[PDB]
């Protein structure tokens, strides 16, 4: 029942629905990301060139793919991946400023999270402009995997400055991790690049990124179908 004021009712409902979608996405995406790739985001000792750029973008297509599918197919809303990225960033930053620094007093420049917005807008624009989920699942996922490390490099570069600490060569991030003692995570847990006899020196950072891109093209696609399952509307009778 209404009388040309429906506009108001819509606006209102929209705001509440935006709140619900945003915060359920925040909770689910944050628990998933922390529960899969949390250790790399927690510390600057783990922001390396091999496993950080390999694992982080591969794991984080899961929720953007599903939310993009749902919000594009039904409402033609292109912000499917951006809202997930912003929610995850907001959750990580709130916990980091209020619990990592507020409770255990780790310094902020030591526990900062990764940046994901540029790739999210890349993915959203790729889906909107082409309107094809397959063209997106290939090109946008590849671009998302490729843009991860260049996006974070301006934040990470000043930490990778050479230094001679007590006779041994180290980086500023390494000194941060060594000085600020974490009783829970020793050094050996660090899933960082260590070098192999088959590893080529300057080709680790790009190649790994490309690997991530390829895997994204898979995972996105898979999760797209998962996003088409949770968007059901069936009423079971038992």
């Amino acid at each position: 029942r209404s009388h040309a004021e429906a506009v108001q009712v819509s606006r209102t409902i929209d705001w509440m629905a935006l709140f619900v979608v945003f915060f359920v996405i925040v909770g689910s995406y944050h628990i998933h990301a922390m529960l899969t790739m949390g250790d790399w985001d927690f510390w600057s000792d783990w922001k390396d060139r091999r496993l950080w750029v390999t694992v982080t973008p591969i794991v984080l297509v899961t929720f953007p793919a599903a939310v993009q599918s749902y919000l594009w197919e039904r409402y033609r809303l292109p912000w499917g991946a951006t809202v997930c990225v912003l929610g995850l960033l907001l959750g990580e930053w709130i916990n980091r400023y209020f619990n990592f620094w507020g409770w255990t007093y780790f310094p902020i420049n030591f526990v900062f999270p990764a940046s994901l917005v540029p790739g999210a807008i890349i993915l959203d624009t790729v889906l909107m402009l082409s309107g094809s989920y397959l063209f997106t699942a290939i090109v946008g996922a590849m671009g998302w995997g490729l843009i991860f490390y260049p996006g974070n490099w301006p934040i990470i570069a000043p930490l990778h400055v050479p230094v001679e600490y007590n006779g041994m060569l180290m980086s500023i991030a390494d000194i941060q991790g060594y000085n600020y003692v974490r009783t829970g995570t020793p050094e050996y847990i660090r899933m960082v690049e260590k070098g192999t006899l088959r590893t080529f020196g300057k080709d680790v950072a790009p190649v790994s990124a490309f690997f991530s891109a390829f895997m994204s093209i898979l995972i996105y696609f898979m999760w797209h179908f998962i996003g088409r399952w949770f968007s059901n509307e069936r009423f079971l009778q038992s």
């Binding site: 033609r76 402009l129 990778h160 230094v163 500023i172 003692v181 009783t183």
Partner: protein
């Protein structure tokens, strides 16, 4: 704060910390405390814990209440993991710098790849002052002196805020128009084209081009500002120097190890043989972080923690000076409240009821010999 609940057999048969010394017990917000000492990786290492092939000298503190300025195992700095050998004594030295004011429980600990944490004795240290006075300066090879507490705090905030603002603007551009419900109604009605106009496509193209250009330009600027960068340094050091300790001249054979379990006490029967040229007296028994002393033979001056120091816990029935070449059997009782407080009785709940420890034998002149005890432990219920 975490050792009272570990298996009392793991605690006994993993590492045997000894000769420990904490420089000060009251530091200020920019002062240092040195925790020196030695450890002996037991030869009968537990089997559910992997060998110390990838270990780490950590410090047990409630979060960064102190910073590890330097940590040495054998004289060499160990800012990485290490490979230790089952059966050798090593020397360790940790220099910490105080961050937060308060009374903190600091413990040395060894982290092992297959078993987890091995926590040593803990000491209470008082830090006075203000946290804002803490400064952590380092000097880079590029010639810059930077304080690690505030270094790269502006840059991270700036870039994260910039990207968050871009994302918020992108969402708010579409949030200015009607949102979910009439959009869904028009989509279900077949009007899927009327919702998106050419202006939206142009705005999206501009956003994508601007994002790519901004990322590339920011990367170029970061490269120019920091031309000299090195990769993240990770590795495991293999060549750690063990301590070359002389072979002990005393031999101890355990014949019966029994502990009551309405109890605080432990009993062993030891056959002791002396091969040195000096009379000898047993002065101490070391168990999993607990030292049982005898006041007649040996006193403590290093300042061991009160809760772990049993001044008169060790009682020997025949603790007379043992003549060289003589063998004799004695009954040794180690009794202290720390056995109950530190849950060394919960060995009753453990699947492997074997105990390990160190005996210290002091001669008349003052020389000390270290002997190892390894034997099964038997409860007594009646």
């Amino acid at each position: 704060h975490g050792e009272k609940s570990q298996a009392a057999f793991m605690r006994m048969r993993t590492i045997h910390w000894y000769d420990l010394s904490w420089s000060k017990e009251k530091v200020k917000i920019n002062e240092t405390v040195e925790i020196k000492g030695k450890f002996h990786v037991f030869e009968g290492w537990p089997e559910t814990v992997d060998e110390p092939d990838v270990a780490f000298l950590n410090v047990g503190m409630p979060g960064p209440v102190f910073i590890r300025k330097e940590s040495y195992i054998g004289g060499q700095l160990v800012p990485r993991s290490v490979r230790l050998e089952i059966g050798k004594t090593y020397d360790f030295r940790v220099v910490l710098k105080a961050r937060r004011p308060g009374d903190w429980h600091v413990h040395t600990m060894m982290n092992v790849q297959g078993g987890g944490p091995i926590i040593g004795p803990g000491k209470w240290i008082t830090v006075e002052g203000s946290m804002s006075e803490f400064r952590n300066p380092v000097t880079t090879l590029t010639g810059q002196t930077v304080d690690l507490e505030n270094y790269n705090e502006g840059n991270t905030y700036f870039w994260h805020a910039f990207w968050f603002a871009i994302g918020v603007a992108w969402i708010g551009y579409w949030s200015r128009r009607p949102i979910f419900i009439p959009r869904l109604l028009m989509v279900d009605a077949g009007r899927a084209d009327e919702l998106v106009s050419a202006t939206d496509r142009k705005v999206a193209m501009g956003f994508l081009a601007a994002t790519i250009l901004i990322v590339v330009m920011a990367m170029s600027s970061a490269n120019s500002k920091y031309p000299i960068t090195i990769p993240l340094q990770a590795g495991t050091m293999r060549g750690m120097k063990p301590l070359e300790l002389p072979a002990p001249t005393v031999s101890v054979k355990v014949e019966d190890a029994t502990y009551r379990v309405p109890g605080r006490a432990m009993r062993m029967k030891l056959t002791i043989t002396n091969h040195g040229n000096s009379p000898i007296r047993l002065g101490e028994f070391y168990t999993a972080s607990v030292r049982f002393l005898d006041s007649d033979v040996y006193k403590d001056t290093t300042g061991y923690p009160e809760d772990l120091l049993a001044e008169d816990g060790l009682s020997v029935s025949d603790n007379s000076p043992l003549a060289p070449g003589e063998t004799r059997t004695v009954d040794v009782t180690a009794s202290d409240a720390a056995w109950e407080v530190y849950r060394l009785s919960d060995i009753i709940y453990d699947p492997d009821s074997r105990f390990a420890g160190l005996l210290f034998f002091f001669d008349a002149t003052g020389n000390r010999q270290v002997v190892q005890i390894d034997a099964p432990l038997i409860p007594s219920f009646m």
